[PDB]
């Protein structure tokens, strides 16, 4: 379960960098991570995830 | 009586001067291979910063060159020519009396060679176009990395 | 003309790219720099024509009207690109006083 | 603190001894200057600025370097 | 083929102003400094004994002279070189100053490195080539 | 350069059956079963005239990342993001060998073409060149700074060419282990590489930038414009149809030599898919050309075929030689 | 010197933990500077450069620096070094064409430009050359620029 935490989060990262335009400022991506996370507590609890904005 | 050898190389162009009342059989044996076209397409071999630029190897190694009386002639050392300054041209050799086709031109005043090198010209246009020959990369070797050629060689009058 | 700049300023404050980030700050810096000294560079230029006409990179040369001509035989006059000895231009200590200050300038802002 | 205080004294009163704290598996940052990267060499020469850095550097003063209405109803 | 623009300049009638006479609508503090371009659009041997050349101006376009007995310099002395650091200044295949010796710095020679403008040009429409063999 | 004339690609067949992403694919060299390795940890074969299940293999804990299948030896290989890099033998269905090593999971794993010799590639920034019998770790392949996402073994050098999440390309010389160059004209990671089977040259994938390149001395050949996608998969035909596969599920067919993009279109998502679930992952063609095989992140595998009816007059070549500048 | 040695290891350590992170790099690298070790924070300056290579910010901290310690040669190689490294980066392009602009070297700073162009810049580089050569009084300069 570690193992998997430490690939999915290499890979969702690996495809924000790819999809940001550049020129975007990129510092707070740490900030997406953090949103998958809460997306799946929501999932885990099935609580519907959205957020604004 | 001074006569213009045209060196149209990849750096610029070279006038050259050649001295025909001092080193007579030196200086015709130059126009004879420019007008031939010898030199066409003739690399630098030889590039040794605040020395020396030397050319005219058929062969582009330091040990060919045929000049027009066979295969070697004789020094011809007059005594009032020395090699004052940068820019002059000589005949390179061997030994004594082993003169080829390939041209010493010295890039800075280099009086040892007197008695032992045949001065039979010098530059009269292009001589910044020689200062950036003299300031291209070599090896260990001293052949220039990135590559010197005469384009073509041709006489004026 | 002024007032479309001061609204091209206006439209131009948000954030948009470093590029045009970088264009604005040279701008900038140009403005506060000021008027060139004309004088101080046509006493550079004309010191550079004698210095350069005793080097012979500099021919002075008159036509049918009868004026001086100064020919660059390189291109190294004005630019020290080309030119091999671009790595010997020690600057005036004026010149490294007043970019120090412009740089304590915007470390005290 | 404590200890600069008794360091101090005895250096005071004659005796001078190295206190060392250098542990067992740390460098010695004050010995050399750690995995060393000098600037890479360009056009321009740079040895009179590195004679004049070092003299900047033996002879640096750590004292010299030390120091460092309306109302209620407008608002 | 240039229809319009030669369509243009048929039907554009002569300016009624006189245009011949004028001078630039903002001077050049001169003088004029200008190229071998607008030169274009605009001792011999063997007498050169007493001649004794004082500076680059003397060497014309160079080319120190080998009857006169003095050490000469057709493009200026050299002093010295006092250890400094610097790179060497080098030139490229035609003459010009080269900066690549800050890209290829640290290095081998046959390392693959793009540094220029025409690394960025795709093959084909690079002037220097005309038929790129492709082939394993 | 006008572009040579190719049918349109339609969707032939849509394969379910994975349970995750279909993150790997590899057709075996006679070109009748293809194996596919997808995030349920899983290793499938499929006939693949009739798309149907052979076989499962099951011996990744994690997401298949890489398939080859050897045509030297009765071999397959796998390579996963639970670090490990198995050999199996096809006539025990069996993992006979490990190469292990990678510190993490493995992306991409390419066998050598005349070499008994396997490279790898992983998130932990190298490339891995393995001795096949002995499972051996001869050269770490250093100098990346990201995850190396994709890499292509050549049979003359550069021998290995990784493409790498830090935006850059490196060509390796094999037997010295050294980078020969360094490509950094991709502005983003790069994920897929891909070699020209007849002539010297390969395409390489970032996002929205497909740039060719002439081998030695990797040489900038061209861009394939208009894709405007992060490209997962790059393939190339032998009639130079190069196919570019997208992300969010675009798909492009383009000429190689032109660079012209004959065909654009989107994948479409097995019932039951989010809308965030069309994307292509892995692709290949078939070992003749006239099958293209998808894996996508609706779990599917999907093939793809020429259209037989279409004509050089019912799809002209759009293609006028334009006259604007590129600023490159 | 015992301070020194504290502050050299606090620092280090937090180098050692995330290397990524340039306020790491940056705060160790001006205390240096304020400790007047030129070639301490030169070191540091070039570790973080081989941690960031492509870093704009931090390409800039090191060449001012050494202008604001008036280590002009230095600077100059810097920015020489990081025009060759990130040539379509204007802000490094501005910055050297500016800093010889304050030198006072016009001929310098035609240089800087002529090698730019080369680049093939934007309308804005192309823009900010016409407008020095027209600064200067080079009118036909200018007009070279605009062909």
């Known amino acids: 379960e570690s193992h998997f935490d430490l690939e999915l989060r290499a890979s969702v990262m690996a495809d924000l960098m790819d999809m940001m335009p550049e020129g975007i400022k990129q510092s707070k991506v740490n900030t997406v991570l953090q949103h998958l996370s809460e997306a799946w507590r929501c999932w885990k609890s099935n609580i519907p995830w959205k957020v604004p904005g | 009586m001074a006569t213009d050898v045209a060196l149209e190389t990849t750096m610029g162009t070279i006038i050259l001067e050649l001295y025909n009342q001092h080193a007579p059989r030196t200086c015709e044996n130059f126009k004879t291979l420019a007008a031939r076209g010898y030199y066409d397409g003739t690399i630098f071999h030889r590039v040794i910063k605040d020395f020396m630029v030397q050319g005219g190897d058929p062969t582009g190694t330091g040990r060919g060159g045929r000049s027009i009386y066979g295969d070697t002639f004789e020094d011809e050392i007059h005594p009032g020519l020395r090699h004052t300054g940068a820019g002059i041209l000589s005949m390179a050799n061997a030994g004594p009396n082993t003169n080829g086709s390939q041209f010493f031109l010295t890039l800075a005043p280099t009086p040892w060679l007197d008695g032992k090198h045949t001065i039979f010209g010098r530059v009269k246009k292009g001589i910044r176009v020689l200062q950036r020959m003299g300031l291209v990369p070599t090896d260990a070797d001293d052949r220039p990395k990135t590559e010197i050629k005469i384009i073509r060689a041709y006489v004026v009058g | 003309k002024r007032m479309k700049k001061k609204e091209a300023h206006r439209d131009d404050t948000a954030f948009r790219d470093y590029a045009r980030e970088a264009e604005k700050t040279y701008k900038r810096q140009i403005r506060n720099m000021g008027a060139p000294d004309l004088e101080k560079y046509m006493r550079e230029k004309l010191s550079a024509i004698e210095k350069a006409a005793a080097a012979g990179t500099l021919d002075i040369i008159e036509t049918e009207d009868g004026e001086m001509i100064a020919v660059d035989k390189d291109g190294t006059f004005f630019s020290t690109a080309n030119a091999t000895d671009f790595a010997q231009h020690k600057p005036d200590k004026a010149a490294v006083d007043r970019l120090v200050a412009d740089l304590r300038k915007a470390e005290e802002a | 603190l404590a200890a600069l205080q008794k360091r101090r004294e005895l250096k005071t009163a004659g005796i001078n001894i190295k206190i060392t704290t250098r542990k067992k598996g740390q460098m010695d940052y004050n010995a050399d200057i750690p995995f060393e990267k000098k600037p890479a060499p360009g056009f321009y020469d740079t040895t009179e600025e590195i004679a004049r850095n070092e003299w900047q550097r033996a002879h640096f003063d750590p004292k010299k370097q030390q120091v460092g209405g309306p109302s209620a109803s407008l608002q | 083929m240039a229809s319009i623009a030669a369509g243009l300049a048929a039907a554009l009638p002569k300016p009624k102003y006189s245009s011949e006479h004028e001078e630039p609508r903002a001077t050049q503090r001169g003088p004029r400094i200008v190229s071998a371009d607008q030169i274009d659009e605009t001792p011999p041997y063997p007498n050169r004994a007493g001649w004794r050349p004082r500076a680059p101006e003397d060497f014309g376009d160079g080319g120190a002279f080998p009857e006169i007995p003095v050490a000469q310099y057709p493009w200026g002395k050299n002093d010295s070189s006092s250890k400094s650091n610097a790179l060497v200044v080098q030139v490229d295949s035609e003459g010009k100053v080269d900066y690549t010796a800050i890209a290829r710095q640290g290095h081998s020679s046959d390392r693959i490195i793009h540094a220029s403008f025409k690394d960025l040009i795709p093959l084909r429409q690079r002037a220097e080539a005309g038929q790129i063999d492709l082939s394993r | 350069p006008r572009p040579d004339w190719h049918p349109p690609w339609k969707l032939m067949r849509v394969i379910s059956g994975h349970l995750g992403w279909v993150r790997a694919l590899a057709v075996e060299p006679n070109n009748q079963w293809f194996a596919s390795g997808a995030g349920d940890r899983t290793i499938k074969i499929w006939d693949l005239a009739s798309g149907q299940l052979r076989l499962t293999l099951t011996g990744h804990i994690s997401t298949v990342r890489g398939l080859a299948v050897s045509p030297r030896h009765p071999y397959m290989f796998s390579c996963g993001e639970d670090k490990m890099v198995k050999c199996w033998d096809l006539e025990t269905n069996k993992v006979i060998r490990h190469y292990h090593g990678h510190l993490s999971g493995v992306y991409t794993l390419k066998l050598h073409p005349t070499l008994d010799v396997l490279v790898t590639g992983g998130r932990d920034g190298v490339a891995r060149v393995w001795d096949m019998r002995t499972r051996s770790n001869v050269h770490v392949l250093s100098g990346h700074t990201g995850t190396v996402a994709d890499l292509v073994c050549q049979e003359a050098d550069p021998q290995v060419i990784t493409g790498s999440l830090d935006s850059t390309v490196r060509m390796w010389d094999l037997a010295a282990g050294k980078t020969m160059g360094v490509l950094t004209h991709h502005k983003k990671g790069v994920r897929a590489l891909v070699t020209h089977p007849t002539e010297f040259t390969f395409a390489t994938a970032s996002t929205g930038s497909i740039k060719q390149w002439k081998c030695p001395e990797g040489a900038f050949m061209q861009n394939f414009e208009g894709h405007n996608a992060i490209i997962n998969t790059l393939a190339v035909n032998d009639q130079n149809v190069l196919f570019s596969g997208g992300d969010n599920g675009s798909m492009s067919f383009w000429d190689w030599k032109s660079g012209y993009r004959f065909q654009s279109l989107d994948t479409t998502a097995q019932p039951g898919s989010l809308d965030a679930e069309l994307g292509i992952m892995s692709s290949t063609f078939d070992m003749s050309g006239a099958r293209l095989i998808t894996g996508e992140a609706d779990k599917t595998i999907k093939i793809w075929k020429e259209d037989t009816t279409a004509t050089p007059e019912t799809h002209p070549i759009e293609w006028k030689p334009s006259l604007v500048r590129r600023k490159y | ?147």
């Open chain 7, 1 to 147: 010197k015992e301070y020194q040695g504290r502050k050299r290891r606090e620092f280090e350590d937090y180098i050692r933990r995330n290397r990524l992170r340039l306020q790491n790099w940056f705060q160790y690298a001006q205390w240096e500077l304020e400790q007047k070790e030129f070639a301490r924070a030169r070191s540091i300056f070039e570790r973080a450069l081989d941690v960031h290579p492509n870093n704009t910010q931090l390409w800039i901290r090191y060449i001012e620096a050494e202008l604001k310690n008036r280590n002009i040669n230095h600077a100059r190689n810097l920015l020489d070094r990081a025009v060759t490294r990130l040539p379509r980066v204007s802000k490094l392009w501005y910055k050297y064409v500016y800093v010889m602009e304050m030198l006072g070297d016009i001929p310098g700073t035609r240089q800087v430009f002529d090698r730019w162009m080369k680049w093939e810049p934007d309308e804005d580089a192309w823009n900010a050359y016409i407008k020095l050569e027209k600064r200067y009084g080079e009118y036909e300069r200018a007009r070279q620029i605009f062909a």
